[PDB]
Symmetry: C2
Subunit: 129 residues, 2 copies
């Protein structure tokens, strides 16, 4: 399955990038996540809630791409429970001075939850949290 | 007349939760219907919300009517305010065991409850996870 959404924010791309690059904070931006822990420069352990008896489901993932102010991408490692990937892009918006943040997640309603998450993110940034 | 009340139990100490709410300028993160909250002095503050296209932004001055560390915070618009409103957040011991039950009551009267519920649930998740 694929989840894709985008929001334009009146802030520099470098500033929005830094927010996402802090992996432990991702569960704030993508609320379907319970926690993200840095294991090393490229690896991290991701966790999400899961009904009984599972409780939670965890897996490890690595960054496949990381370009300051431009993009951050990741994908679960071979053997991870839930096979998934994601990519966040920071692109100059056509209108005026703003950054379009494009988020695409894959795993093999979510769209509504991601929309809400991104709009919330937009709002906080544009008001100054 | 628009009254709203909700409560959520959170597995954290009262003082800590009270601490977040007491930071007035950060209230817009807790109560999403608010655009901004500005401190004017120990007891007064300026509140602002997003008004429909006809208008654009409506603000008024308010004052804290009660501030009991780790227990309660109450506020109310001053007379003449474009929008009459009051609020009260209590931090009570949760019956079950441990944890604090945050109770929020808001009243507004221009010249809702689902949004508050969502805001409170996110506040619960955020606090209980530590992010």
């Amino acid at each position: 399955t694929v989840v894709r959404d985008a929001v334009t924010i009146g802030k520099p791309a470098e500033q929005l990038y830094a927010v996402w690059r802090d992996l432990p904070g991702l569960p704030l931006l993508m609320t379907h996540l319970r926690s993200v822990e840095v294991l090393d420069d490229k690896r991290s352990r991701w966790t999400v809630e899961a009904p009984a008896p599972l409780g939670t489901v965890s897996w490890e993932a690595e960054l496949t791409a990381d370009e300051p102010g431009k993009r951050i991408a990741w994908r679960s490692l071979p053997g991870a429970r839930i096979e998934n990937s994601g990519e966040v892009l920071f692109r100059p918006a056509p209108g005026a001075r703003g950054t379009e943040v494009v988020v695409r997640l894959t795993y093999r309603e979510p769209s509504q939850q991601l929309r809400d998450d991104l709009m919330r993110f937009k709002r906080e940034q544009e008001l100054g949290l």
